[PDB]
Amino acid sequence: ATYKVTLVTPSGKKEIDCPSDEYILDAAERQGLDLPFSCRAGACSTCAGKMVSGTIDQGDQSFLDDDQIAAGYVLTCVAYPTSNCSIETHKEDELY
Amino acid sequence: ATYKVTLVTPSGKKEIDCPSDEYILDAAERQGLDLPFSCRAGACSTCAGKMVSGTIDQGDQSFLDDDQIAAGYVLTCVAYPTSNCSIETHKEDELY
Amino acid sequence: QFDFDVVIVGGGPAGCTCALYTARSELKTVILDKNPAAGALAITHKIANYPGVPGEMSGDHLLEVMRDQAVEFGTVYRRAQVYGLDLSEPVKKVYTPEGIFTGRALVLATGAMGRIASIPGEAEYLGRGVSYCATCDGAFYRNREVVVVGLNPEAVEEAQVLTKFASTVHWITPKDPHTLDGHADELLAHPSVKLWEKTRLIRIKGEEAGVTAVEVRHPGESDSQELLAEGVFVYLQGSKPITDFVAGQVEMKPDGGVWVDEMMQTSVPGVWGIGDIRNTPFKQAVVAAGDGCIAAMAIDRFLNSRKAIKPDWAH
Amino acid sequence: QFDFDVVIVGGGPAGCTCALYTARSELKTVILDKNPAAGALAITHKIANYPGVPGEMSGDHLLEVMRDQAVEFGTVYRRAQVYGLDLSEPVKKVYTPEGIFTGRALVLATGAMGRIASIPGEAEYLGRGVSYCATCDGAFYRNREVVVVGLNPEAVEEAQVLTKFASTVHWITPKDPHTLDGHADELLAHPSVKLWEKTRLIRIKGEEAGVTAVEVRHPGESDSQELLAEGVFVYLQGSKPITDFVAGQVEMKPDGGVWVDEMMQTSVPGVWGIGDIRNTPFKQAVVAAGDGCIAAMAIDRFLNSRKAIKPDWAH
Ligand SMILES: Cc1cc2nc3c(=O)[nH]c(=O)nc-3n(C[C@H](O)[C@H](O)[C@H](O)COP(=O)(O)OP(=O)(O)OC[C@H]3O[C@@H](n4cnc5c(N)ncnc54)[C@H](O)[C@@H]3O)c2cc1C
Numbered sequence: 001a002t003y004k005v006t007l008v009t010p011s012g013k014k015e016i017d018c019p020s021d022e023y024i025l026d027a028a029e030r031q032g033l034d035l036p037f038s039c040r041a042g043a044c045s046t047c048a049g050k051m052v053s054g055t056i057d058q059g060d061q062s063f064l065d066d067d068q069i070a071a072g073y074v075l076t077c078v079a080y081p082t083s084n085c086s087i088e089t090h091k092e093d094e095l096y
Numbered sequence: 097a098t099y100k101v102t103l104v105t106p107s108g109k110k111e112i113d114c115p116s117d118e119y120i121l122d123a124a125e126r127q128g129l130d131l132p133f134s135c136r137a138g139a140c141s142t143c144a145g146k147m148v149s150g151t152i153d154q155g156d157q158s159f160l161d162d163d164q165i166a167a168g169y170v171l172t173c174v175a176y177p178t179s180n181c182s183i184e185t186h187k188e189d190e191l192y
Numbered sequence: 193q194f195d196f197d198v199v200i201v202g203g204g205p206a207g208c209t210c211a212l213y214t215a216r217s218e219l220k221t222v223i224l225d226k227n228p229a230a231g232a233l234a235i236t237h238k239i240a241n242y243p244g245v246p247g248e249m250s251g252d253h254l255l256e257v258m259r260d261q262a263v264e265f266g267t268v269y270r271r272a273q274v275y276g277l278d279l280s281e282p283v284k285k286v287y288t289p290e291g292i293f294t295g296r297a298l299v300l301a302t303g304a305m306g307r308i309a310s311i312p313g314e315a316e317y318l319g320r321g322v323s324y325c326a327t328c329d330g331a332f333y334r335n336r337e338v339v340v341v342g343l344n345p346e347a348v349e350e351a352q353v354l355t356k357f358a359s360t361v362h363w364i365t366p367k368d369p370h371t372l373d374g375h376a377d378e379l380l381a382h383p384s385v386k387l388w389e390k391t392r393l394i395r396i397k398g399e400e401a402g403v404t405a406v407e408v409r410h411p412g413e414s415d416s417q418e419l420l421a422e423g424v425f426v427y428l429q430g431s432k433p434i435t436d437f438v439a440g441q442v443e444m445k446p447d448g449g450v451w452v453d454e455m456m457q458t459s460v461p462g463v464w465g466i467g468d469i470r471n472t473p474f475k476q477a478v479v480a481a482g483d484g485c486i487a488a489m490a491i492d493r494f495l496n497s498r499k500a501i502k503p504d505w506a507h
Numbered sequence: 508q509f510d511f512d513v514v515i516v517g518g519g520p521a522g523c524t525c526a527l528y529t530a531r532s533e534l535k536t537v538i539l540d541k542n543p544a545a546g547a548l549a550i551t552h553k554i555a556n557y558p559g560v561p562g563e564m565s566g567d568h569l570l571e572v573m574r575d576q577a578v579e580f581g582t583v584y585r586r587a588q589v590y591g592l593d594l595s596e597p598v599k600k601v602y603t604p605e606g607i608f609t610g611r612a613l614v615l616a617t618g619a620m621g622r623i624a625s626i627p628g629e630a631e632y633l634g635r636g637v638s639y640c641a642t643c644d645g646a647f648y649r650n651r652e653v654v655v656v657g658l659n660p661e662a663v664e665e666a667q668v669l670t671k672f673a674s675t676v677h678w679i680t681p682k683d684p685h686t687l688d689g690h691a692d693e694l695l696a697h698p699s700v701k702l703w704e705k706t707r708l709i710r711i712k713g714e715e716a717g718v719t720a721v722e723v724r725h726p727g728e729s730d731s732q733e734l735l736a737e738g739v740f741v742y743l744q745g746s747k748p749i750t751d752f753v754a755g756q757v758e759m760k761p762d763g764g765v766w767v768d769e770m771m772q773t774s775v776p777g778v779w780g781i782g783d784i785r786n787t788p789f790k791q792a793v794v795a796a797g798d799g800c801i802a803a804m805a806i807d808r809f810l811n812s813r814k815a816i817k818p819d820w821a822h
Pocket residue numbers: 134135139140201202203204205206207224225226227228229230231232233234235236238239240241242272273274275301302303304305434437466467468469474475476477478480
């Protein structure tokens with residue numbers, strides 16, 4: 001199953017395809033986008049984004065607390081799409 | 097069509113059934129015989145045998161030359177029976 | 193990453209040994225190995241005549257030791273199939289799907305498990321639907337039907353590659369593939385794969401544009417079944433030196449092996465040939481390994497402009 | 508070879524800097540470094556805020572320079588994973604598979620790349636099939652099935668270790684190993700290795716004797732697969748101070764980091780803690796390096812019974 005992911009970056013929106021078994025960040029890079037990252041392991045917040053629309057699976061995540069997750073924040077480096085979804089990128093600074 | 101294959105091994109004769117779409121070696125093993133093999137791909141002659149009677153199809157064969165084929169030698173791992181036939185096993189040393 | 197002192201095509205005992213010695217000479221060395229399971233030594237289930245290696249030993253565990261040795265001394269091992277070469281200039285160019293590798297010296301070490309085209313239409317439609325490299329041609333079969341011939345680890349891995357592009361992957365095996373004991377379970381779970389077990393490919397068919405179909409038949413049945421296809425990938429094992437990717441740029445012996453001089457160097461300066469690609473009657477692992485050592489030492493002399501061959505003895 | 512003035516556990520910027528200073532003080536110093544590619548600085552692709560180091564610089568290149576500095580001044584650098592400590596006596600004992608190292612002073616410098624056990628059954632079967640050290644436990648899995656979880660240089664190096672014992676090494680990665688650009692090609696060429704790419708280990712199960720199997724699953728799929736296994740080696744990267752090998756022998760701040768005084772000394776005399784194992788919010792390389800120098804100079808005063816801290820200037 002492959003889901004259409006629209007990333008809302010500082011430069012505007014860009015639509016990509018992401019297989020259900022691919023991380024958002026990896027799909028975006030494969031499709032020519034440079035998005036922010038450090039650990040690539042769900043252990044920091046450099047890759048933070050925030051959900052506008054739809055669903056993801058970030059069970060591999062280990063850095064955000066439940067209030068942050070419940071506010072729509074997501075680590076795009078370990079997030080699988082579970083629907084077609086919209087995500088604001090470059091959202092780390094809001095966590096601080 | 098299923099054919100009766102009599103294999104003449106160093107331990108004596110044994111008759112097996114071999115469907116026309118099964119390799120001699122595979123049929124023999126399925127029926128409890130331990131015969132010599134290495135590549136099992138027609139790319140060596142560890143499994144070499146020699147036609148005592150009847151005929152086989154070794155078009156999948158790819159290691160024997162025309163003189164060896166014309167002398168009755170066969171690679172049993174890629175030989176289909178095309179009749180009721182008899183084959184001497186363990187014949188590699190005779191090829192050379 | 194891509195520019196090396198030495199590029200070795202093939203990671204059998206010849207190539208792994210050559211790399212062992214060139215890496216110890218502190219030459220930047222890469223092995224480009226199509227498939228570690230596809231060489232002659234890799235497929236021998238028992239080897240009991242390799243000197244220095246006693247007891248029960250399988251060919252693929254012996255090769256692993258040789259490969260790890262080469263890497264412990266600095267060799268870069270890359271899984272990559274070479275489909276072509278540019279030998280026109282002093283830096284040799286080696287074409288793979290993983291990229292273009294460069295070497296000041298090139299070693300051909302691909303062995304003799306090749307099967308010369310066996311099936312009607314195979315030679316005729318080469319480069320027009322018939323291929324031996326899925327990582328090189330697979331993308332051009334997006335949403336097209338393809339055929340894979342052969343039951344071996346190469347065939348399985350190449351078919352997996354093709355399931356990322358093809359509409360359907362028709363797999364033709366002479367026996368049931370569970371015979372490869374789980375290696376084919378993932379492939380067969382793929383919704384693109386149709387398994388044609390216990391069938392034989394009689395013929396590859398087509399037009400001027402290329403392949404349009406294959407003719408297959410169950411052994412003993414006497415009536416054929418046509419499957420439409422645009423790509424046919426053939427992975428059968430044989431006895432012949434794997435040389436077609438060289439495209440006639442080095443001289444071959446009448447027997448079909450690569451010609452070399454006493455220092456294992458081919459007709460083309462800067463290019464060496466070692467192991468069973470040479471097609472001598474002495475197809476044994478320690479002989480192949482020996483070729484690789486000789487070439488490595490000739491290469492070291494060449495690349496550092498030495499006065500003499502320099503031995504590699506313990507300090 | 509085993510008795511040292513200073514034993515430093517961990518070779519990141521904290522440990523390498525500590526060693527630089529203790530070695531210059533002509534204290535016999537060893538770094539026991541599990542894996543040079545596994546620390547936080549080592550995995551930084553670019554670092555542009557390390558003062559004194561301008562331009563384009565990767566974290567592992569910067570670490571190499573600091574390691575080389577420490578060794579140039581006499582540090583013994585050893586690849587060795589510490590699995591335990593005896594802090595009961597003035598001479599500290601440091602247990603590794605490479606042997607037992609002793610120091611008159613001990614420095615804990617393992618960083619915060621650690622993950623709390625995350626997978627159902629992981630905590631429950633630790634010491635009963637679940638392990639984080641292949642050089643420690645690998646020998647007990649001779650001719651047995653094992654699982655490696657993670658795609659990072661530690662996972663790759665530890666899997667290579669286990670291929671010398673295990674029947675089969677099941678490798679579970681969330682990304683394709685093509686994602687390390689060939690860095691894993693040797694591992695994957697090993698005949699014992701089965702690759703489970705883009706899969707997750709959702710559960711570890713067993714009996715009272717220990718682990719018998721794992722449940723693996725492709726993310727987004729409903730179907731799972733059970734794999735029989737007796738060893739599960741988990742190498743996932745996290746955010747947490749690497750402290751479990753200390754087994755609670757030094758006091759921890761509630762945050763989980765090692766507590767230390769003004770001079771970087773833990774609650775146990777003769778034992779120092781430096782860098783991100785302390786779990787301050789100031790996780791930067793130059794801060795870590797600073798900790799290491801402070802501890803080195805407190806250590807020099809201690810071990811040479813000086814009346815004051817001695818500055819290291821003019822050379
Ligand atoms: C069934 C069998 C049993 C044998 N048993 C024994 C035995 O018991 N004892 C003994 O001493 N010898 C034995 N041999 C012979 C021995 O295995 C060979 O002589 C030896 O392996 C040849 O080494 P090589 O490196 O030249 O070729 P190989 O071992 O065939 O290795 C060639 C390598 O090149 C790679 N390659 C091929 N094409 C490409 C390409 N285009 N790009 C990149 N890489 C490529 C292959 O994947 C492979 O890794 C046996 C051979 C066979 C076939």
